[PDB]
């Protein structure tokens, strides 16, 4: 019938466009209180309540937090979506390129999930998801550094679903494959020929197409016994 | 809002107690003509269409195949459930115990596939599932011969979603932990509390959890760009 | 210094010809008293006792364990290596072609090690190695059923790893990727082409390079602590 | 015979004490040319060439580089295994644990690799590997950010390894399990015995182990068409 979600309080951070976008905007439709922190809050999503922040700053996630909470409830889920590239073969990555992925990638995602998890760890529910990726698992050329880091938020949600399994906690991953966002979809023609070929379904994957692996992991109801796993969203591309 | 998931014809094989029941009794409370095989059909599922039927025999499951697309029509889903255990050590295990699980486990689970697939790439849709187990993956001990076939399916999955992606059908595994089932219920107190002691989640499954999983892949909505992919369900028992 | 492999007694499955062959002539030149057996025994190789066996038929095996304990000694190392193809695609595979690999890949590897394991435990000394595969861990077209068998595999390895290690017995499997043999030498030039572009080192590869990673685990004292761990060989084809 | 790391220039970075000493000391008996990088150089390895450097300042190790090609020759391999932790649950981490684990696990690694790459590219050789864990793999309790970092290197050397192939350049990544050192000598006998009981080979692993696996990746003989691997030695602890 339903997935425990209505009335439920969730953050997705990076949610004003692409991917976030599309998981703020499904969350809505099954009825939770879905709130967004980015760096712009357009959105085009009204009724979302967009929350201006940066995910490399934790004073102002923890802004974000106190915020949300205070106008929309204790939260029960985070969705840790922001990510950036600085996509290059590895001699040329600057440490300004690792600094960058590392704080937004890895850092931010743990600064996104800090401020709300000593409350979730109150109430004894919780579902945390962090994006990503196909290159955090397969590896990818020209992103040495945007690999590592969603590589490491896997073993950041490991090792999280183990801390927070005695509160009922879950946390959990999802590895999109190539998606059709404003950023991919602006990426050579013959690139975007040479890797769909790769692909066995023949095609990138669609946005709302993640939002709903988020959606069935973020379900207290579709997932209560789903907690360390990568959630693959490739169409085969990476088995 | 909705999984594509009401009028669709679903096939589950060992589906008249333990998980394959919960997998069935889901499906129909989600709109799904779902149809099940097994040795036995009491259920007691009234309203399920029991087939008897045994996975090890070709023929036998090209009749049940028969039967449901005569009485429901074409299939859309095929949950490939049945399956057995011969527990021993190594050696103690003799060709019967390894023929046993091979035949069930296996290539049962082919011969529950070979009899719907060709229909499904005439109408360019279909959701294959294969269930198992943390053991397939992990390994475990007094379990060398099912393991081996756990660890099998997820190898034919993988080979399958491959195959089938040029027809938009899909095929992935779903690797279960330890769930509460009739058969583990009997286990010896000492054995369950020495096992719930690894679980992070401190419990055992349950099959209604499975069942979710299994739903959230036969969706033709939440799981669209879903192939190819092993679904753990295990509390963080196996990460 | 040195690999502990002199005077070592090692038993490889499928060793006249192929990757097999290879094993047994590196073996060699480690200073192991090497045995194989296989359908034929010509070998060209002179000095490495040939048993014809089938691993199909466990009387078979167990002969050949008995006339290999008496020529040679007690067994330390067994290499499961002897597999076969029945390719085709999911639906055109006759239960002839699954009985076909199933017998050979999965049973037949177990009635590889069964007549040397009980021995095994008693001098609490062995090294088992199964063979494969890039297509038992990703999955391949036209290959649903050596894929099932390949991923099985990895699946008994990993058992009885757990089971072996009471008795300082290890279990480990190689997963090699695609490699010049006289079966894959005689593919179409065309098809090698369109997979050796999607290998990042751009080559097939060569059976001395299997042989290498299976005198790693063969060695009690290069992998003393490793167990249960699957070595992938493929040139980051599969990564 | 013999592994092709003769007069091979190898530098190891932590490597005064702990397994960095092992690999660093086992190299050195295959007739390689050893250097390490650390914040002390006593060692007591005489032989071995200590070079005082940071692994999170870039300018630290471009320096001790330059030193080592120039006393020793053009490098061939790379460890990187200098590592830290700062471990504590999820909400007790402070921004401070988090940048200290992610410089020197992380970045550091980056720029363990940086200032030799270039080189290795030109002379067309070069055999690269990265260290750990089983954290970063299965995850841990109160390692969420040495999880996340050792989960990073592995995805790191996957893209490394891509990029790398081009050039016959190979990366790879050792996966230690519980490793007998001078640190985890000195955790509590009650933690242990609790951990050592997880493991099915009855003991933790000895840095001359880690050492073999280090070795082996290394060799330009033993693992020529291995790259973009992960090779876990853990006596079946997480499998």
Not at 94 to 123: C, H, Q
Not at 198 to 206: L, N, Q, T
Request: zero cysteines; a neutral charge; charged letters at 20%.
């Amino acid at each position: 019938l339903s997935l425990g979600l209505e009335d439920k309080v969730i953050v997705v951070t990076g949610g004003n466009r692409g991917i976030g976008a599309a998981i703020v905007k499904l969350l809505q439709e099954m009825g939770a209180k879905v709130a967004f922190t980015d760096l712009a809050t357009d959105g085009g999503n009204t009724e979302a309540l967009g929350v201006v922040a940066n995910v490399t700053d934790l004073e102002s996630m923890t802004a974000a937090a106190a915020e949300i909470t205070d106008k929309l409830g204790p939260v029960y889920g985070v969705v840790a979506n922001a990510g950036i590239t600085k996509d290059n073969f590895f001699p040329k990555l600057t440490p300004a390129d690792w600094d960058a992925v590392l704080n937004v990638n890895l850092k931010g995602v743990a600064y996104s999930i800090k401020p709300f998890i000593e409350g979730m760890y109150e109430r004894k529910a919780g579902s945390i998801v962090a994006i990503s990726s196909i290159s955090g698992e397969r590896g990818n050329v020209g992103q040495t550094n945007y690999s590592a880091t969603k590589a490491g938020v896997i073993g950041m949600m490991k090792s999280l679903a183990r801390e927070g399994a005695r509160y009922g906690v879950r946390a959990n991953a999802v590895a999109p494959g190539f998606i059709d966002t404003e950023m991919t979809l602006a990426i050579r023609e013959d690139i975007r020929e040479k890797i769909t070929k790769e692909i066995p379904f023949r095609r990138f994957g669609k946005p709302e197409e993640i939002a709903w692996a988020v959606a069935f992991l973020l379900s207290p109801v579709a997932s209560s016994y789903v907690t360390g796993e990568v959630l693959r969203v490739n169409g085969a591309h990476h088995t």
